[PDB]
Amino acid sequence: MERTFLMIKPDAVQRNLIGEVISRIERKGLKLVGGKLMQVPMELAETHYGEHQGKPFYNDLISFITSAPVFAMVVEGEDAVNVSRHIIGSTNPSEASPGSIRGDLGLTVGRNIIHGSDSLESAEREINLWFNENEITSYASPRDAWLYE
């Protein structure tokens, strides 16, 4: 089943929104398959956001993601990558739909609560980067028969 990488960013953690954010993912029918609260080391920060190295916000991004722990997650479900991005909302919280996580909880583009992989390819990339196979569980859930045909 399709898997994506989600990350509750340090703003959400420092605003005590971990449970709230997790709830929104669960109730959507997505399966939490891997999850750890962790401090992000510089190397991991920089390789995760390597595609932004030149940008204006880059230094501020590394600073921010390392400033306090994150909750890194692997989420499993049909179309999980797009489904997650759908309930997460647009990058800028003021363009994100009300009812989405960024729409409801985020104020600014720089502090926008959660990360989700943007494609199938970056999903597998980010998952390998943040997680080892032995930290990703695999289980059947009671509701599985009721989310899918």
Ligand SMILES: Nc1ncnc2c1ncn2[C@@H]1O[C@H](COP(=O)(O)OP(=O)(O)O)[C@@H](O)[C@H]1O
């Ligand atoms: N103008 C900006 N200033 C500060 N941080 C930004 C800005 N734009 C994007 N970011 C950071 O990057 C994260 C994801 O958006 P971005 O990296 O631009 O695209 P993608 O979601 O494809 O990686 C945002 O949640 C935010 O933390």
Ligand code: VO4
């Ligand atoms: O931190 V993100 O690249 O899923 O907006």
